[PDB]
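Exercise 7. Predict the structure of EOTAXIN-3 from Homo sapiens.
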Amino acid sequence: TRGSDISKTCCFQYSHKPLPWTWVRSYEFTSNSCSQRAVIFTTKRGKKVCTHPRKKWVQKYISLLKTPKQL
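Solution. The predicted structure, encoded as tokens:
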């Protein structure tokens, strides 16, 4: 919320593994202009990782890291 709100960058590689919540912070969906829509999980080190929204494990990390409750 107080880092880089202008991080509208696309993604490409997708990690397939449960990241250690100890180093996880939040997440963020890619932009619509990107040619490959993908979710992203941010860690405590400041490194945002891209991932696929299809994988159920990712849907569990997004709802857990933070719920989309913004109108």
